[PDB]
Write a new protein. Structure first.
Ligand SMILES: [Tl+]
Ligand SMILES: [Tl+]
Ligand SMILES: [Tl+]
Ligand SMILES: [Tl+]
Lengths: 95, 95, 95, 95
């Protein structure tokens, strides 16, 4: 459960690293903005304060969403049910 | 079921209070706009009428989404299946 | 299954009617824009071409999302698994 | 499992082709922008860099979201659990 979470954590980080490199390079964003935009994209928030301006960027974003959404939300789910929930229950009973 | 819903309700409120304080303070939003933005972020609507302008804000928003989405949608689900649904079924049969 | 879908269909329509009336009135949108915005909000797309400008509107939108998301996506799911899927399978076998 | 994925893949492509044609034609987008916008809409990212300006476009987008979200996310799920996951597990054991 903990190994599941480790793996999804690593996969998420690698996905976000890929987006940070791509958007910093092709769309010219500061690395911090590239990471932020990658996260806002794959969690489907999509503020649109950054959005790809190049056709290269738009095509990559299509593929990045389709490949990355499933991973991000798998990690969010496991983080919910395997880390946050136990800590919440545990806080419910003094020791 | 009702205690489950109570807990998720409290956790959601606390999460939204955290975002309201942070965005009011660091991003200078009116408290009402900070709450509204927090909700629009964690439900993944993301209009982008407010979005963080500071690097502090962008980093916090990354973490806030990852930690908060799972909680908000747990609460929405329980609110759907444990409160709204019974009332809907109950309205279906006169008394 | 068909009655389930009927009910969720009616509930969705009523929810969207509520948003259309509210946003047309309080935020001054054309009714068509109010419906469009209501749909874009509750499906969490959130383009932000329309977003509430009044505090009344922002508070209503907070509550509307929390109460309406669960309903809309229940309807989308049932529409997926109970209407679209059978028609797709049925198209797979000539008659 | 592979046939399931094939079918959802074809259905997704057809849905995106429909949106590309419609938005290129009625909203005057370049085909590439129409595809990009279709994807950003049905995955619920919704940057809003493109959004429909015509009433025809707004009405179509309402219907497109309701009919298309369920399909897209079915495909993303199957792509997650039926293609990405096995490859990830398989990379975990040298051969
Ligand atoms: Tl958005
Ligand atoms: Tl937006
Ligand atoms: Tl979303
Ligand atoms: Tl969104």
């Amino acid at each position: 459960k903990d190994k599941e979470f480790q793996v999804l954590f690593v996969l998420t980080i690698l996905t976000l690293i890929s987006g940070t490199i791509f958007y910093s390079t092709v769309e010219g964003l500061r690395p911090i903005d590239a990471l932020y935009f990658s996260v806002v994209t794959l969690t489907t928030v999509g503020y649109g304060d950054f959005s790809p301006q190049t056709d290269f960027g738009k095509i990559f974003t299509i593929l990045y969403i389709f490949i990355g959404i499933g991973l991000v939300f798998g990690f969010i789910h496991k983080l919910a049910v395997n880390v946050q929930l136990p800590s919440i229950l545990s806080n419910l009973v003094p020791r």
